[PDB]
Design a binder for this molecule. Sequence first.
Ligand code: CA
Ligand code: CA
Ligand code: CA
Length: 341
Amino acid sequence: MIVLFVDFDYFYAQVEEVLNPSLKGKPVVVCVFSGRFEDSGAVATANYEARKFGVKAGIPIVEAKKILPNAVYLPMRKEVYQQVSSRIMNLLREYSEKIEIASIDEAYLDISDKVRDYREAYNLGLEIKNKILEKEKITVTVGISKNKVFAKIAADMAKPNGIKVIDDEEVKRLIRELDIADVPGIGNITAEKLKKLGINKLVDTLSIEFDKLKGMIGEAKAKYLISLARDEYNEPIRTRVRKSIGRIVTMKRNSRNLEEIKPYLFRAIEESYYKLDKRIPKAIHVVAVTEDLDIVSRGRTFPHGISKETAYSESVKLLQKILEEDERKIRRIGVRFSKFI
DNA sequence: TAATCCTTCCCCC
DNA sequence: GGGGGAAGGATTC
Ligand SMILES: [Ca+2]
Ligand SMILES: [Ca+2]
Ligand SMILES: [Ca+2]
């Protein structure tokens, strides 16, 4: 099999540059301003100009300014980006029917048909990198391999703005040499548990007795790693479906008083519905971010579709259930709609 | 600025 | 025992 993974470089900041070329060659930081206090918020993404110095996704907006006090700071604009992305996901469709849109900027292609070997593979990587650069003036990175996991890893290496192949032989050394923590789906926490169990390489997973790996990190995860290590991973490419929509927001001050919260909660549903568009959910969830930054949630399924009027009531009851079964204050509040018709 | 996998529950064959 | 399906939380991106 031969899978080609495509990944957009620092996407949000690149589109920002694209939309005002002057920004070219400068450190651009796409930020999310919570508006709580002076320059409060976080970092959505920074371009190469900023990254290399430390500014990265997750750092506060105040920390970033201490490093690059004079870079460009712009508020995120999901809508525009999302649309830019949509277009690009099309140039690709025009490269196969088997396309999996993993995220707003990640996508996998199943070219096992078209191309005959890694040779023609590269040609198409290039032929593809180009197209998107022409049509939309945006740089990406290609990864090619026996499957989605490596095609992706393939892309993490050759980044930014590169293209890389990882053929069987090389995969082999990776299953052994490649770090366990650098394997897709293994976040700190897991990579951590995998530490104790003495696992540090995909190989290491073959020594331990399954059931101890299962009682630890989970059967799915466990099986996932195994198949990978034994060189038997091969999940196909499928067209994923938005199985949920929501929208959380923050208040100027943490609160516990229901009246003080409602207004925020509604604004949340309001936007959530706008997103929904044409879609009708059967499930609802109120999500609260307590002051200590711990997420608390309460929801409910209905035997029918939820109207907007219904959401307003349902959400105010589930929020009450939250202030009840919890004494902490709320820093953020939002709704999540699922189980569409 | 959603996907997925778990774990525990609560019927009820 | 175990199918089926919330519900709430844990984990990755
Ligand atoms: Ca990226
Ligand atoms: Ca990782
Ligand atoms: Ca908790």
